[PDB]
Amino acid sequence: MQFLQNIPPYLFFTGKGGVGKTSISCATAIRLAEQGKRVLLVSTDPASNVGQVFSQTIGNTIQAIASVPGLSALEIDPQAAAQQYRARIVDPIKGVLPDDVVSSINEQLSGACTTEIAAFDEFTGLLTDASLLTRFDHIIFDTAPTGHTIRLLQLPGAWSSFIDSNPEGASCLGPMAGLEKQREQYAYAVEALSDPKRTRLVLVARLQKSTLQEVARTHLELAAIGLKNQYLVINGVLPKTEAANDTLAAAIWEREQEALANLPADLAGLPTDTLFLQPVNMVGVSALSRLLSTQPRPDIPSLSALVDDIARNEHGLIMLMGKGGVGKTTMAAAIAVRLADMGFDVHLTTSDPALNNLQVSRIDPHEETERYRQHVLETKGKELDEAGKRLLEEDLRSPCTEEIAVFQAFSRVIREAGKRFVVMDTAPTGHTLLLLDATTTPMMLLQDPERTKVLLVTLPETTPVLEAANLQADLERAGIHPWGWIINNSLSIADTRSPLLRMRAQQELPQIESVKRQHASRVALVPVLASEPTGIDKLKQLAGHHHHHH
Ligand SMILES: Nc1ncnc2c1ncn2[C@@H]1O[C@H](COP(=O)(O)OP(=O)(O)OP(=O)(O)O)[C@@H](O)[C@H]1O
Numbered sequence: 033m034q035f036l037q038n039i040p041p042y043l044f045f046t047g048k049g050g051v052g053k054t055s056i057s058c059a060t061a062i063r064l065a066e067q068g069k070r071v072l073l074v075s076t077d078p079a080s081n082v083g084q085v086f087s088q089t090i091g092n093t094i095q096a097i098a099s100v101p102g103l104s105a106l107e108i109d110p111q112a113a114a115q116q117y118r119a120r121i122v123d124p125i126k127g128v129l130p131d132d133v134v135s136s137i138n139e140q141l142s143g144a145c146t147t148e149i150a151a152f153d154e155f156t157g158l159l160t161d162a163s164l165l166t167r168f169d170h171i172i173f174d175t176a177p178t179g180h181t182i183r184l185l186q187l188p189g190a191w192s193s194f195i196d197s198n199p200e201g202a203s204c205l206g207p208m209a210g211l212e213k214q215r216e217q218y219a220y221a222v223e224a225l226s227d228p229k230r231t232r233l234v235l236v237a238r239l240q241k242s243t244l245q246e247v248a249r250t251h252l253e254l255a256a257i258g259l260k261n262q263y264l265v266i267n268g269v270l271p272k273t274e275a276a277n278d279t280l281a282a283a284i285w286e287r288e289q290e291a292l293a294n295l296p297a298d299l300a301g302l303p304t305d306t307l308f309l310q311p312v313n314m315v316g317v318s319a320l321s322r323l324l325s326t327q328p329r330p331d332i333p334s335l336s337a338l339v340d341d342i343a344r345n346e347h348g349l350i351m352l353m354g355k356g357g358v359g360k361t362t363m364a365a366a367i368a369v370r371l372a373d374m375g376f377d378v379h380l381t382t383s384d385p386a387l388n389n390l391q392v393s394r395i396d397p398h399e400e401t402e403r404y405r406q407h408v409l410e411t412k413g414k415e416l417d418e419a420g421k422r423l424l425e426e427d428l429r430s431p432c433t434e435e436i437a438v439f440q441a442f443s444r445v446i447r448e449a450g451k452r453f454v455v456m457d458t459a460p461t462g463h464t465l466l467l468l469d470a471t472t473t474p475m476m477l478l479q480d481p482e483r484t485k486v487l488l489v490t491l492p493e494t495t496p497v498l499e500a501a502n503l504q505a506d507l508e509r510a511g512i513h514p515w516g517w518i519i520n521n522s523l524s525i526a527d528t529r530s531p532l533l534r535m536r537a538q539q540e541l542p543q544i545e546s547v548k549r550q551h552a553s554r555v556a557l558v559p560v561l562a563s564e565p566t567g568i569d570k571l572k573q574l575a576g577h578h579h580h581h582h
Pocket residue numbers: 241242354355356357358359360361362363384457520521558559560561562563564565566574
């Protein structure tokens with residue numbers, strides 16, 4: 033594997049939730065250890081499981097992994113770091129300012145942005161400690177910082193300017209005032225990230241058009257920033273020696289082969305390695321090492337049942353939520369189609385390009401975001417100096433900015449949810465709704481269980497379910513309780529003779545049980561489609577069927 037050759041002292045793995053960042057991190061950690069190298073694996077996931085895979089406990093202290101000499105680990109819990117980070121800002125003014133005030137500021141430090149900034153504070157610590165390279169040859173991170181976070185800390189304005197405490201725009205700039213290291217260390221860290229002699233960035237992806245799109249995006253952003261030592265690792269690829277008998281496995285192998293060959297242009301000139309889809313979720317040194325080789329039904333109702341229940345009231349705001357790529361848009365489309373075929377007036381709204389009983393409102397997120405950014409600039413940038421304006425423009429470059437702008441656009445038609453059905457394929461986070469509420473926002477409507485039905489879409493996989501769970505908890509803090517969960521891309525409810533797909537379908541079981549037993553009131557299982565759910569044809573196939581009853 034090219035990504036394994038000549039790794040510099042700092043190695044970072046980046047990619048969407050569930051692509052396999054941690055697995056590959058551990059497997060690489062082992063490979064290096066067995067070569068006689070001293071390796072430090074840095075676990076950075078919210079609910080770390082690296083200790084589990086290695087059959088021991090790890091913590092905020094560097095401890096050796098007894099089950100593999102040469103390797104040690106360290107956990108950097110991001111939720112805890114965020115907590116301490118927020119508390120380090122608020123505790124000082126606690127008792128000096130009103131409670132509602134300290135309460136509002138605390139909320140401003142409870143979003144994904146504060147977490148990335150606090151996580152960057154930790155990365156900076158490790159990256160600027162030369163002594164570490166005195167003890168190890170390699171330091172491996174199972175997540176990487178975003179281009180957004182790096183930009184923010186490299187902006188001069190972030191150091192010489194300050195932005196008022198308004199309701200819009202700079203909403204997420206609050207964390208900056210929390211940095212306690214000197215400006216020079218953060219710049220040094222970024223310097224270390226941009227040095228190919230010190231840091232190698234590995235983009236983890238899967239052979240899917242949608243995912244490669246995102247990865248290609250990340251690559252460009254991190255490169256313009258200065259990280260040009262990038263490697264592409266395509267994980268979980270299906271071996272042709274499985275497309276043999278079964279028809280689904282053959283359709284999949286085909287879908288991957290097209291993409292694999294039609295890789296986005298930007299990723300083409302990138303050194304690339306592919307890993308194979310393993311039978312069982314790696315859990316030991318043996319299983320993990322096997323990953324780096326060069327050679328190879330649940331009792332849950334169909335989407336149809338969920339929709340029949342959504343259909344009872346005969347109207348309502350239906351919002352699909354979840355992480356990027358889980359299938360929000362497809363479920364939104366599938367739901368809107370079935371509801372319409374049941375004879376109801378349905379208004380589907382989307383933020384992506386794709387009978388008369390159904391109307392579709394397409395919104396371009398790019399222009400909504402710009403209308404928004406433009407608005408926040410006439411409002412706040414008014415008295416900012418140029419450096420500060422750039423800081424404000426980078427803050428309005430946050431994920432949540434688009435999220436907010438698109439919701440505001442949708443809100444234009446939310447008033448129709450009273451007479452009929454309005455289905456949305458994306459929504460802001462709990463944190464963001466709470467923020468907007470303090471500012472416009474139909475908060476009460478979203479919180480009403482009879483008017484709004486929020487659905488959480490996820491995958492029958494560990495990380496996705498975890499991230500889904502956390503989204504839900506955040507929404508609940510905003511008084512919104514998801515009405516049901518949709519587990520998309522399931523091999524369990526799929527027709528396959530392929531021995532490997534069956535072994536994979538069996539891996540989902542504990543994840544699916546998790547959702548039913550601990551995360552959701554209602555659940556729907558959608559199959560991994562043998563085709564691209566692009567036509568209303570295959571879109572109707574996703575739903576399955578629901579037997580009428582009284
Ligand atoms: N059940 C399924 N079977 C096969 N493919 C699916 C399924 N659900 C989604 N996909 C495919 O996966 C891709 C991602 O899904 P989709 O665009 O609906 O996700 P999303 O969460 O709306 O994405 P984003 O977060 O990018 O807006 C699509 O190209 C789509 O056709």
